[PDB]
Amino acid sequence: KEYDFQKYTTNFETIQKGIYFNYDWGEGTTWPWQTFQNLNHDMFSGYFHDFASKFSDKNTVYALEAGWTASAWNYTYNYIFPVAHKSTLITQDEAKYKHFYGATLILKVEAMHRITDTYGPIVYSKFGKNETNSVDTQEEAYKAFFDDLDKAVDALDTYLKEGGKEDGVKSINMCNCPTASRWIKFANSLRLRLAMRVSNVDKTLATSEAQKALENSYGVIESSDENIQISGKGYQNPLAGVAGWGETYMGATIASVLNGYEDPRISIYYNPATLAEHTEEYLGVPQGVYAKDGDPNYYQSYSFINTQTITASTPAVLLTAAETWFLRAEASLRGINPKNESAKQCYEAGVQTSFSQWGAGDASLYLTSKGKPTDYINYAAGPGKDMKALITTTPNFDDAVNQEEQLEKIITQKWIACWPEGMEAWAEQRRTGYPKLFKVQTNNSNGTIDTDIMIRRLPFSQDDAKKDPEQYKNLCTALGGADNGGTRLWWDTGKNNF
Template sequence: MNKIKYTTALLLGGLLSFSSCTDNFADFNSTEGAYTDELQKYDNQTNLVPFSTIQKGIIYQTGVDGTDWQYQIVQNLVADMFCGYFHDMTGSFNANNSTYNLNNGWTSAMWVYTYGYVMPSIADAEALNTEKEWPLYHAITKILKVATLHRVSDYYGPILYDGFGTADQKPQSQEEVYKRFFEDLGTAVNILKDYKGGISFESADFMMPEGKRTPAQWLKFANSLRLRLAMRVSNAAPELAEEQAKAALDAANGGVLETANETVGEYGIRNPLGGVAGWSEVYMNANLESFLKGYNDPRLKSYFNPAQDGRDKDGNIIKEVAGVKQLGSIEGDYKGVRQGTGVADNRYSTHSQTTITTGSKIIVMSAAEVWFLRAEAALRGYTSEDVENCYKQGITVSFSQWDANGVSDYLESEETPAAYVDAFDKKFDADAPTSITPKWDESATPEQKLERIITQKWLALYPEGCEAWAEQRRTGYPQLIKVAVNNSGNTISTDDMIRRVFFNQDYKTDNKALYDALVGKLGGADNGGTRLWWDTGRNNF
């Protein structure tokens, strides 16, 4: 087993430039610590060992205390912020991604860690688990590979997918790789729906809830993932999207996620978002404040903790933070940080922080998301389902997932997002980005219906920023508050907002052949203003 891993690492050669340490590598690449080759022969451990790394690598983490910073630079300082969920209160962070002055060490981390740690284990699993000998493991490998690599493509565009670590390895365009995603998911679905049992994956499975670690549940996940990606390409390739959406929702293929207790995640593993939050570096983004407070959304208290006024060393309220005077009390309120202020101090340190802890389950995909996908598929005419019913089911399942009350009133709410009021400087105030309401309006235009669907989907996807950012770019919804300061050097439009992150800039000198090949497949400049293939800038109906 290790021969494959080490060979792959050798073949990578100059492909990856590591600017970070590789702490806990051995633990990261085993199911229960260290296994010798001999021990791995028992209970199919030789086949199962790679899956621990792969499952942890979807939403990147090691599950080990002390490595949460890796998740922070892979996702929290990138997609989690750009999607409008989170922001760091630390002034030093405002000089980089927040103001579109992209930090290469952060924006390259998704690529570096996925291809440095996760893809070698995917290559192991592909080599070990052939369809003929190990059909169940073969199918699950394909599902996990797509679940991992579509996130990478949604950051950069072109990626390495087929032939990884071999002489045939070469970049593929996003259009090419998405078609391969569908092929691999189709293969997995065909295997799983006909699987008769005999081999179990339960001992290595920590993504499905207890009691649901079955081939049938993995089949539901495969179909749900297929539906997610089908809607992702709906503006760029509507015929392909319709074909894949219909296949995903074909009852004969095994169904999709439908209930709150079917959340696909990572159970019993340290949540790295909670680790970063423990350093007081995960705060509410002003966009979530606008929508959650404007809607009087009952999920607000499940998502964030209240803010507080400034205090001196004795705990007395002084209404001043980092030497900056507050304009009014925020005690007990829910306050977010606007992206792109560029302030150099820590004035927002008393604002609302996430409730996510290291013990919270890591959410990869929820049934609520799937209901919103079904709503959009019906809106586009791909299915005959009732759009309004699917939309309401999405909200209802999300409320159930977060143990929130009041869903009936919320579904009838005509509240709108609130204006953002900065606690310290009025120049950072912002009008509400939209007037869309939770209440369904059957007389609305298809575009207005899509905005309503995606806005609620965005609220339900929390705290999974990669998916939220991809969908916001694809559809333009929810409409977000723009950055106050744009330091991109005119490569990113303030109005159009950031569209992607650039490839590892070290490759320009360390691996120019790879860099040039990736940019060639991108079809545009390697900067944050270039749209990805599925990001057409319009919604086709």
Template structure:
């Protein structure tokens, strides 16, 4: 990115400053006086205005097409949650592993422009003077950038903005170590300033409640610790146990989950309802309908294919025989289940309380101190997810030991039908192997994470669970194994053009070729135990 970091930072600050001034003038009924920098600093507006873009660009709220490229046509689909009924680019697109580089630039550019640049400015302005404001920005930075690393692997993080000529990448291991260090520092700072009111006016998640921010930071650290538990078990346990045994604790109740309380519609609402470009994935149908899971009605609407029936689309559809163009094929598949309004609110879920119980369940399975009872956490995760949507029938669901994922039938193209890939049931089985127990935990975690496809895709790659259907058409030219599915996104064109030396170094840190079949550092092949 060469010197673009510094330029973008200045541009964002100036733009937001001017916007703030304009809003102030409107409030003064046309009074032409200027709002000075000193007046802004009185209530921290000089840095406060930088937080909203950070919250709203962990993934981009608006315009919806930007989110569609940043996450919806990659992680939301690769996770097995959603898929597109229209075969974009005549079926040669991300979903069939013929990756569209122009689409994937947004996965990189949005968080760097709107999160990393703002975090750097806030750090420079507040680290010494108002450390609690700095601490929150660090937590937001880790929230955004671990997602970027979980897409690409090596990223520009610890040396961001240091050079005017090139940007040096950290290996993914180095980036994760930095994430842990940044969270540790932020948690300590907030613990030391627990009653400070300074962030309340800018907080789109917790209303300035630092205790909740500490709980979230602990939960985020536990998430990252579990992520590296196969590749760096000692480091993972050490970091995980810091969170599990922290005096403030972790997220444990639905009101404490990490949600961005935005003012705009969830971008998938437009993609789903107005454009008809996304629908239920066949893997979601197989698992939710097979389990007779009451959450299915909170996540999806019934289809127009058959009254009262939820129907998903197989991932990775090419332009099928018998269709003249993309829109003709879309017309048949757009009648399948669209997402329900209940999950497409302006209050965007980035970490629900249910996830934390599943993290604790896996931590207990791995023998980490402070994790608690494995079965108890597993069942509490399900219970908390049901409660999030106001659903009953918890005890019957949790105790059911017979329901399994169901076979998938495509009523439009029978050749896309496929048998279920798993026979895992819901009820806890203490006599099962650890691998079977983990499949239960991750399958239920996957259900509870919806609609947050980035985290679901990462967990699928790390564990292999739940067992989601492969693409119908693999157009990667042999780069991606159809059964293993896509493992990452290659480094983006904007970096290759402006930072070629940095990318070349990043490839050496990747440990394999810069393609979609190369595993990330934490993506270790083989069993989980």
């Protein structure tokens, strides 16, 4: 039992700690995650912003910092993916570990879809195969993800049909999947996410994968008690770590939305500003206000994250029941939900589910409301400007003038519900155009990123390019455009196609 424990279980610990990355390879925690995600996706999503003016001449104004943007790639390929691959190799042919094989595959897709959604082309289907060209196009990576999820759900279903105990996954549960069936439900929900991601570029694939996701007999996540979220084995939530450094402020777009909707999640997510004369208001930091080291930290008294809500021991949310309902709402809106359920029913279930996750009460009154997001007013000192609210849609689903506005409601509410996880939020914003994030006030991208289109991706890792110039060339070829922040990823068509 102990030889097998060291053989299999430790790999699962590294992988699960390495998704919302806070894996300690020997040099500490928190600080890697800060560049992995917090100074990229979490800001670009509109959720969060730092206060330090020393950073305000970098990512916030689209002058992308090479060391920061490479981090998701570097940390994942250095420490996490090779372990997921090893775990695949040692379980795929093991008669008694079909469940661990299934779980490995699901975690591998969970980790790596976040990387392709950041950069585009990645190394995935050809990893460890020593082929001439190691690179998957994003389309090829997505197809490999769907294939891996098929293999996973097959393996776990076989494990159960052969008489494997539901709780045989107990020793590897750091993601709130205590049974084999719950891993399959995780896979089904993740497949639905990926299906909606590809719905604008490849409706045929989206349709077939959504059908598989929503007809699989093990179900999808419907209750917040089953949310996929990381905890255990000494894992600490790195968002709480960065909050402890004083660096996680509310973003202007989420302040606009939550204030205008009079959203009861507002005080759960954030605290009121400490700025004099504004101490009962929620104030969000506008992205792209230029400043540099030596300047005052103009936004230091804006609203901060709620550190009773987000603590070191708080599980790190990855995939929620609420999100799953909003995915079903979109599938219904697109006519590709095999279940007999409407977009409205799913939308309202998503909002109610999100309220319940956070303890915000019942959503019935909110779902009838006519609140509109509020304008951004620059109360801070410095060169910031006021901005008129770009989002005009209400929480009431019936107040849509067309189905594009219905999709906007679904995605905007999904964005509230995915908080604080900036990667899913940012990916969906790029994919759908929603929510309508405030644009950067200053764009120092040297023409590589368009203010109105907004940032589309992160550039490839130059640390990897220096190790492997041929691979960098291959990644660039697979991207089909310039390696900068303005090139659309494969799933980003620039419009919603029904």
